[PDB]
Amino acid sequence: ISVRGLAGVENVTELKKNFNRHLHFTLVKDRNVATPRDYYFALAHTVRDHLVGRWIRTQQHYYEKDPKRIYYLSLEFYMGRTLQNTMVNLALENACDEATYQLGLDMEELEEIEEDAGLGNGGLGRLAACFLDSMATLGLAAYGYGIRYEFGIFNQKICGGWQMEEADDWLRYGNPWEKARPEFTLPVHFYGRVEHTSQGAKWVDTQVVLAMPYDTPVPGYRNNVVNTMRLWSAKAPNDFNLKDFNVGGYIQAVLDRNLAENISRVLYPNDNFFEGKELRLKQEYFVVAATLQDIIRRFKSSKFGCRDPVRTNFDAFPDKVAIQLNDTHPSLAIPELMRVLVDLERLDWDKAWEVTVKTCAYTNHTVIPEALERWPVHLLETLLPRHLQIIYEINQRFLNRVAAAFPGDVDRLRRMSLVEEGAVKRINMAHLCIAGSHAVNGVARIHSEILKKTIFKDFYELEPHKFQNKTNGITPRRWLVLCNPGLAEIIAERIGEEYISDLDQLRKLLSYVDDEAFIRDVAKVKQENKLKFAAYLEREYKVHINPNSLFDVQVKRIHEYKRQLLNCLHVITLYNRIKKEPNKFVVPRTVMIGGKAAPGYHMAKMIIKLITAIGDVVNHDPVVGDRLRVIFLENYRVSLAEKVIPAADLSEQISTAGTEASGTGNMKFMLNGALTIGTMDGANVEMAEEAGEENFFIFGMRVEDVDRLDQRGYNAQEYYDRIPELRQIIEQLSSGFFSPKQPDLFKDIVNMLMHHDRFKVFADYEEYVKCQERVSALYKNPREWTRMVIRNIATSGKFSSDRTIAQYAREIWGVEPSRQRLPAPDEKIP
Amino acid sequence: ISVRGLAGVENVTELKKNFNRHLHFTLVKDRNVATPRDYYFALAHTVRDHLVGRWIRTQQHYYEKDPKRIYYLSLEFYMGRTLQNTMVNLALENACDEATYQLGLDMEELEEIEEDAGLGNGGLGRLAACFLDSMATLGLAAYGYGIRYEFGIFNQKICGGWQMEEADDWLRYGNPWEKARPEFTLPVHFYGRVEHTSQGAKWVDTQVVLAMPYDTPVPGYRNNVVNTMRLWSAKAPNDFNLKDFNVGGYIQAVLDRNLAENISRVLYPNDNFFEGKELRLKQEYFVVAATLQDIIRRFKSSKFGCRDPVRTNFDAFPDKVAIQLNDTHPSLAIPELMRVLVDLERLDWDKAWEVTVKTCAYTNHTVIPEALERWPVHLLETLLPRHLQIIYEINQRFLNRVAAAFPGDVDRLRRMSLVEEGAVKRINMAHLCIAGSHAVNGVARIHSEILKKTIFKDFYELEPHKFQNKTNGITPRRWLVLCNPGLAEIIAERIGEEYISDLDQLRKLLSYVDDEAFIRDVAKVKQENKLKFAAYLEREYKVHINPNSLFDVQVKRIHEYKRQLLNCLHVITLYNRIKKEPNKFVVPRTVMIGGKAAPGYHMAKMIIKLITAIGDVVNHDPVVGDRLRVIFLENYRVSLAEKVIPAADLSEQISTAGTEASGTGNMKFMLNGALTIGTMDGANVEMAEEAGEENFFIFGMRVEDVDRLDQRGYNAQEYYDRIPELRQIIEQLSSGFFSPKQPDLFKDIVNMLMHHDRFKVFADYEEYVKCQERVSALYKNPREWTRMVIRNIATSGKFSSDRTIAQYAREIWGVEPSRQRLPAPDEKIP
Ligand SMILES: O=C1N[C@@]2(O[C@H](CO)[C@@H](O)[C@H](O)[C@H]2O)C(=O)N1O
Ligand SMILES: O=C1N[C@@]2(O[C@H](CO)[C@@H](O)[C@H](O)[C@H]2O)C(=O)N1O
Ligand SMILES: *Cc1c(COP(=O)(O)O)cnc(C)c1O
Ligand SMILES: *Cc1c(COP(=O)(O)O)cnc(C)c1O
């Protein structure tokens, strides 16, 4: 059937009875009233059963051996569905497929019922998920720590061409994967004030919110290792949240508990944008405060909570603990770690600081200013008074270090301050992370360099040793084996299976680049993938597409810097050219654009309306026929990504050079047999460098060109004046060609494009369509297109998160990865 | 060990492995980190396993045979713990005891970990629970329908002698008994307006709240029948509760979902008191609207949703459905049933009314005015506009019936109206229930008569056939076998086990009234029970009592009509007499008073402070010694009741004649070997009538005496003037003898007692202490005290809820009870 494992005689039989056990005893249903949803759950529970055994021994193991522990703090974990992934990592896919078949059910139909764990916005959240999978696969004693939002990223609905947001009640029917651990609930404080008494400061008169942990298992790939992802939930204490007496109402007191519990209610839907709301800050401290207590508790036990030097010496803390900050969201972990060490454990400042810096590491994910976290002091002042005092003290000492290194450099001092003066004083979380971490890293080579040359230049001059790079990657398991079993099979037919946990081995495929059979096969799976997607489209969304056309897709969050608008201009151009010479042949294309716009991002929501507007015109023009279709992919999410990417021919990664930190969707497309048209931005540079620029469609300004243009000054009018095709499009928008009933509907877009384009869309227009012509040319030559594909796929190895994690492990955490199978799952009950 | 069933070889082995299965796979724990709470859950899950098989066949059975269905609507279901009760009804107690013993655990210690299902205030809620157990035991196709509050009755804490309320988070660690059924979620409407168009009225522009059902199994006693208790939970729709666009904030929209979900958040803590809050009304319509849709759906399927006359003829509705209204809380079911039938199904008014009246039955639970539900019209007008129109129409037609029966009786007309004029117009829910039901019943003979003679006299004259009586009862399973296995064993040793489901058989114990062995045994278990309780007291609450003294206990909600105050006066009297003649012998007593006071009931909270105040003085007077102890039983609840009642010697049921509808605690004490001192009120009358007045300690005014006194006019001063002992107590309170630091602390109590005692406490004082002397006299003669006990126990049979339910079944529902064992639980998987 494929290499989804063995469909053993004994195990298929075993699976079936357990499926029935759960349908009866767990779901309390009988075959006569069970619905597909019930069947999905019976299975989920049956599969979940197979990894609890391993989960328990893994955790027990780490307790015995006591290795250095890795704590990945992130406010986002974009997990997606987990049924299939679990079957794959446990080599259960074929057995389950067989068993469910014998039970008369279609496993695939059941998998579609699982809701997505959308506790993330996009790239940042998904990276965290891929990392977790890789850390488990590499045998690291790692724990993912986050917030268990009851409402993840909103579900996107397109009404009249507009995006409509609606709550994502992913827990409505329950989550068979998590395990509530109410017995490990911890308290978290807010507000209050600071008392300075005799021997130390005291954080007093605080409001308490409880943090209840929920554990979700993270299985490594076929190595019997199952790590843990701990998500915190906010719960109100039953005392003060009722006990603070003297009139108000008993009923009201109980109803008001949903005020402390609102902390973990919903994820903020912003991608690459900072919103200074109190609720957000509360979420940030919540996950940090709770997690740290859990980290220290585990440390106090270790082998110190037995003997060792005997005396809670936190000197070995950094030798046993490593906490990675996914962006600045969990930045409060630094001043919080100090608070505990200094205020509670009573360590001297300097000893505490040394420990803190040695255990903390920060990862930066963007360079755009509006995404940078700068919290107003009055907020920190009210909500976390002691933390503010600690930050000021950290700042004081840090600046003193600077002054001593650059005597007289007074401007440098204000520039590096963690505190920003002005309208309102703010705290620059990024400066905080750099100062309190022993390593700061970028997510792509170019991005990392930009940090050193630009944004954090002063910091780099002060401590050049801190700065590193760790190019992002993706998991070959979910992003290849899971979503594209067809391609994975033919690859395995030639080079084996060892590449799933050693993607570098894909290079061996280079020697089949001229293989007639392979070329035919690679081309076959892609054709099958396009047919399956074209079907899914009519199934769930309804209104036909042509599977023979070039599948041109751009899927990622909607942003001005991602330039979906640039993609739009090309589409309209294609349309106009066809309308000019109707009977001229052109390579058919189905351009698919999908992504979510943050609710408050007006421009982004305007662009979505534009895309659908274009499709309304283009898709109903009889002269165009099936040569050009414009489709907006609704509710783009992980599960949807697993469907389009494998069916894509052309991957669009066209951000303005220097704005996309790295990108990961690009990597997903490269590994699944799609060719990339893009700019020298983020990881695109390393991808082309890996596959050879001849096998990539690069175009547009490089970073330097962008800067040159900024010195000069960007004037869009020039481009409007010198390019008729471009002018023609702008006037079409301006006159309502795409919005008849509302002629001025797109005035904001035009106005912006002509007068305030921060991302110079026009500057890359010419080189973009020219480049687009080159890909159409190559598509006309199937054999050569496929050979170029084989060059990309065979060379994507470097982009596996296993590589990235191995680097973090060695160069930052100080731990050695291991592909050693944990001693089976075997029963055991001590 | 006892008759808690057989500890079979095969089953104890089977139990143990399943216990382990759950500890591992369900709880995801290993023996090395498992805590008592974990062990309790492993067991709970293991036990729950044994009744899902029976649960499924029971429900399937009712689907095949299609009998008349009984729907018990109540806003309260005071369930308590359910582990032990389930073991008892399934004959699993000894096997589980053995198995857990072999696993090295103390079952009793684990049972104490289970949280109480406190979804009730007191008597009314507990009755519902006992009924459910009896309906299952009698093989009725009955369903308990209610609200799944996430916060039940508050947990009571005594701080400085005062009651402190704190949220009862009973779901904190989960509820292993319930089964969420999100797939059966129903919509419920609120607000909106009424459109009258061509063919009918339409309820429009309503706000929607979803109702999610949760099923809890209700096992009959050893008959393999497992009925269902369906509790609704409020859930917000994800559309409009987000989709009603045009600014407000996406985050705020999501946080605001906890506004529609507040409906099922908390139970109103009022007992015998009406609070006209909108939230309460919302809870009432919520449970009614959801339940009815479920009732009709089930009906539409029946055997009509196949063939029959073919044409949704609701003529057979009453032959297939019976809905019992537990008090007026679910009264909206009447106008709602009409709404559906008339508005949606399109039946003519008269046909709809005939059906409604024929399927609805109302049970009244109190006669005090402040407990009567009278909803302001402006509230119904805003929240349920169509229902108001229906009520007015029901009223119109009803009054027309009255006018026709009593021509010219204009005062009768305004008296019987469902609508009450005055300050604000109100709707008398009680009048509504009488008019729309085919039967109205009281809960005790005297209470039922009072309804006919007083409160509902006019209604009785109009339709004398509607009025009946159904004396309350309690379940012998939980209230005897479960809480007093010792007494149950010795009874079974002589007369067998058939009495557990046929309590009348207890009469056979009369012939052992002179049996020397029995007398010794009955006396022995009571001594063991008192020793166990005296221990529990020092264990969990700490501060000693004497197990040789008379256990004088009064446990029930705190009310002015229950007269805990009268009990207080006696206690102080005993104290004063001892202080007068220290070296005179008196029968030692431990008087225990416990109960919860509604948060807003100032007087009730004042009485609690008084009780503790008395104990502070009495319990620390060296001259008193161990002859007199005053203890306030904290957080009285079902689980606590199961501990005190079996250890009680004297049961206090001293309400003012005519105020306690029936009472059930009284019955609990009678069946557990305690003697009763009380007034001729509620079921007390029937109890003494059953055991013979010579075996009861009756005292005080009868109902007639109370009325005579009211004609005359009640003046407390008289009693104050003629009784020195009484005067002495009042002046002690007035001068701060019991409240040194705050001398005027009890001025409200004294003031009330002297000037506004609605329950004439003073009027029964003399006869009460005199009577109390008689019980002390009898306690001095162990042999005779025990013989009188045997007379009570042997004669309590009539007070089993099996008797009550059998009467409801035959005289109201039109169904025949059956003690037929359902065809085993045996596997089966069709
Ligand atoms: O704030 C960010 N930064 C992002 O991080 C991702 C993972 O590092 C990068 O691949 C992406 O290029 C960057 O924009 C991202 O997707 N979001 O939301
Ligand atoms: O409103 C009432 N009515 C009550 O109903 C119980 C069950 O019918 C009766 O036994 C009790 O006497 C009556 O007060 C009760 O306990 N509450 O709260
Ligand atoms: C991988 C992924 C992303 C990131 O895409 P980029 O192209 O790097 O912005 C965002 N959303 C989903 C659902 C993804 O799977
Ligand atoms: C039985 C019971 C009641 C009712 O007691 P009465 O004496 O009838 O008022 C109230 N609370 C609990 C916990 C009970 O078990």
Swiss-Prot record, chains A, B:
The record's InterPro entries line, in alphabetical order, gives: Glycg_phsphrylas (IPR011833), Glyco_trans_35 (IPR000811), Pyridoxal_P_attach_site (IPR035090)
| A single cellular component GO annotation | skeletal muscle myofibril
Q: Which PROSITE patterns match?
A: PHOSPHORYLASE
Please give the organism: Oryctolagus cuniculus
PANTHER family named among the record's database cross-references: GLYCOGEN PHOSPHORYLASE, GLYCOGEN PHOSPHORYLASE, MUSCLE FORM
Residues marked Can be labeled by an AMP analog (site) = Y143
Full protein name: Glycogen phosphorylase, muscle form
* The family this protein is said to belong to: Belongs to the glycogen phosphorylase family.
